[PDB]
């Protein structure tokens, strides 16, 4: 292109170029700056006018000499995609960093794409079992559903997702997408090793997963558009290969956080807390590029690393808008020693309702909630005084609820190594039966030690016998 420029400034990873002609790129166009770091791919985000843009840099910055030539490569860069994206872990550029070498292009698609419309929706409300009891009872999945975890600082976020992959993604076809934004490299290696081993990545055959991994050491600007690339791979599967897909994001707090960082440099006034004023818009775009369509139904599970907790921080609040089910996982419930560390009073799904997933199922879940809410309510009084200074009826409720709380545990089958304890996977069918019994207090007579850190109702009973010895 005759659209050439020099680099006027390099303030962070938000470079400014000064094109030498009045032929300019456009916003979301792409530039390649030739450097001894190879090409660096940047995306024009503002025009600051007088042929001086301000560009987000999607490839890391450093050692850049001012006045370095630019060339305009136009539009949102188009990665090369196929079913040969499957079994490849790709960097932001789109290059296999699992180093199987270049992806066989079929369709190359622009990283930024438009979100499908209200008319291109498809409405679903499916049942999908997670093999996790608490999840099944409170928030049973669907086949396009968008679930989100609001995991605290290392609350087994990876472990939870791994469990979901282990169960759900071997129980779902079409394709499945793992995209890990600002991932912890070692954890990614574990996943990669595990995936190849469990054939999820099968390189002799075809992999039923494709992978995007963007490290957290990658400069902020890169991390923001790790997401956009992932959404395109997902769209290729969703749309042009038509498949009902899956998508994992770990974490989409990293997307929000990356936006908050850049906002200052971009000249944008960072809104409340510090998140970009475009936080709302950008969350919206992303979540309507993940929304279900009549060309493919894409179940997404997105991990939100809520920083220092507090979900009324603007980014978790705006996440809640775009999730049909949530599974808030919180440190307090983790402290109570229950694994899974999922809050039972903070999970929801629209699918939970009436006879949608069974009136009886809904009734059992309702009762669990009331009982727990009473139980949490009287924690102040019980501790300051005792449980004896509250009614006998209440004491039965409390005793029942302590058991329920302990019962909710179900050892992880992918942190079975880490815990040491072999995992437990409990069916949805089993779950309805199990909780029904407990609500009638039938098994409220056998040790709370038996209830603690074990899965199934049958397992509790057996452990009662074991304890008795």
């Amino acid at each position: 292109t005759p659209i050439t420029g020099k680099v006027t400034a390099v303030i962070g990873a938000i470079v400014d170029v000064h094109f030498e002609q009045s032929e300019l790129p456009a916003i979301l166009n792409a530039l390649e700056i030739k450097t001894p770091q190879g090409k660096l791919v940047l995306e024009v985000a503002q025009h600051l006018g007088e042929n001086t843009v301000r560009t987000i840099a999607m490839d890391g910055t450093e050692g850049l000499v001012r006045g370095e030539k630019v060339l305009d490569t136009g539009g949102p860069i188009s990665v090369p995609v196929g079913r040969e994206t499957l079994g490849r872990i790709i960097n932001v550029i789109g290059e296999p960093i699992d180093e199987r070498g270049p992806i066989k292009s079929k369709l190359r698609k622009p990283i930024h794409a438009d979100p499908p419309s209200f008319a291109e929706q498809s409405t679903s409300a499916e049942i999908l079992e997670t093999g996790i009891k608490v999840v099944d009872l409170l928030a049973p999945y669907a086949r396009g559903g968008k679930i989100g975890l609001f995991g605290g600082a290392g609350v087994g976020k990876t472990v939870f997702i791994q469990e979901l992959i282990n169960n759900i993604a071997k129980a779902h076809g079409g394709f499945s997408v793992f995209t890990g934004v600002g991932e912890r490299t070692r954890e990614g290696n574990d996943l990669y090793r595990e995936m190849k081993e469990t054939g999820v990545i099968n390189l002799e055959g075809e992999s039923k997963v494709a992978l995007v991994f963007g490290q957290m050491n990658e400069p902020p600007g890169a991390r923001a558009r790790v997401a956009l690339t992932g959404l395109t791979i997902a769209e290729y599967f969703r749309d042009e290969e038509g498949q009902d897909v899956l998508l994992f994001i770990d974490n989409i707090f990293r997307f929000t956080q990356a936006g908050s960082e850049v906002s200052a440099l971009l000249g944008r006034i960072p809104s409340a807390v510090g998140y970009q004023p475009t936080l709302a818009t950008d969350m919206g775009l992303l979540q309507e590029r993940i929304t279900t369509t009549k060309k493919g139904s894409v179940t997404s599970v997105q991990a939100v690393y809520v920083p220092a907790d507090d979900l009324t921080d603007p980014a978790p609040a705006t996440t809640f808008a775009h999730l049909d089910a949530t599974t808030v996982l919180s440190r307090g419930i983790s402290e109570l020693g229950i694994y899974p560390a999922v809050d039972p009073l903070d999970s929801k799904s629209r699918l939970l309702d009436a006879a949608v997933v069974g009136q009886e199922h809904y009734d059992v879940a309702s009762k669990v909630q009331e009982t727990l809410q009473t139980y949490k309510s009287l924690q102040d009084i019980i501790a300051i005084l005792g449980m004896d200074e509250l009614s006998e009826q209440d004491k039965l409720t409390v005793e029942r609820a302590r058991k329920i709380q302990r019962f909710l545990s179900q050892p992880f089958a992918v942190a079975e190594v880490f815990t040491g304890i072999p995992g437990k996977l409990v069916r949805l069918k089993d779950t309805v039966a199990s909780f029904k019994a407990v609500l009638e207090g039938k098994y409220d007579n056998i040790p709370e030690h038996a209830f603690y850190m074990v899965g199934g109702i049958e397992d509790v009973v057996a452990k009662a016998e074991k304890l008795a010895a």
Partner: protein
């Protein structure tokens, strides 16, 4: 779809500005929905406008204002949020019979940020409005659904907006409930209770169950 099943979308209009759709478009969306209502109102036809969520309108106007770098109000919501909301809200009225009687009725809907109603945008709306319908999440878990916290709910127009039959019947409903709430709190400090308090409590429990609402049931 729920509306189409209940065939209420032979009269439901949905004005939308989805989260994808622009922040300028989001800001403009409430005022143009209001205009559609005013046309009904003008014709003498009656309608009711639900504004879900006005809180997100404030975010949108905030984004706009901050990218036009105008001096923003507290909580970064520009200091003229009140002007936007007030002009919007006072358009809903039950007009005189020299104005065709037409009444647009408005139900503004704000989403509480942890019950932080002392936040600038919730406070402003409360001043503008003729009622508060504070709900409780804790009561959602407690089993009610819809779950309402009626102690922080008001209707400042009284029983003039209430059905005459219903005014008579629910006359002491408030008083009974008020006594129930007080007694119930006292009861949890485990003090021994006389019959007069337990009359209230026993009556009160029956009332509590009477109040409860289950999703998607009109009556």
């Amino acid at each position: 779809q729920t509306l189409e099943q209940h065939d209420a979308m032979k009269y439901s209009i949905i004005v939308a500005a989805t989260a994808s759709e622009a922040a300028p478009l989001q800001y403009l969306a409430p005022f143009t929905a209001a205009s559609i209502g005013e046309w009904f109102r003008d014709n003498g036809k009656h309608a009711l406008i639900v504004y879900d969520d006005l809180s997100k309108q404030a975010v949108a106007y905030r984004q706009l204002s901050l990218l036009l770098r105008r001096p923003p109000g507290r909580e970064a919501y520009p200091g003229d949020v009140f002007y936007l909301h007030s002009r919007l809200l006072e358009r809903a009225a039950k007009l005189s019979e020299k104005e065709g009687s037409g009444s647009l009725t408005a139900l503004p809907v704000i989403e509480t940020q942890g019950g932080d109603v002392s936040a600038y945008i919730p406070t402003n709306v409360i001043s503008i409005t003729d009622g508060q319908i504070f709900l409780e999440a804790e009561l959602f878990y407690k089993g009610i659904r819809p779950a309402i916290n009626v102690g922080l709910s008001v209707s400042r127009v009284g029983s003039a907006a209430q059905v005459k039959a219903l005014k008579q019947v629910a006359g002491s409903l408030k008083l009974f409930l008020a006594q129930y709430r007080e007694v119930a709190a006292f009861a949890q400090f485990g003090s021994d209770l006389d019959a007069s308090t337990k009359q209230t409590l026993v009556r009160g429990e029956r009332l509590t169950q009477l109040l409860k609402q289950n999703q998607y049931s009109p009556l």
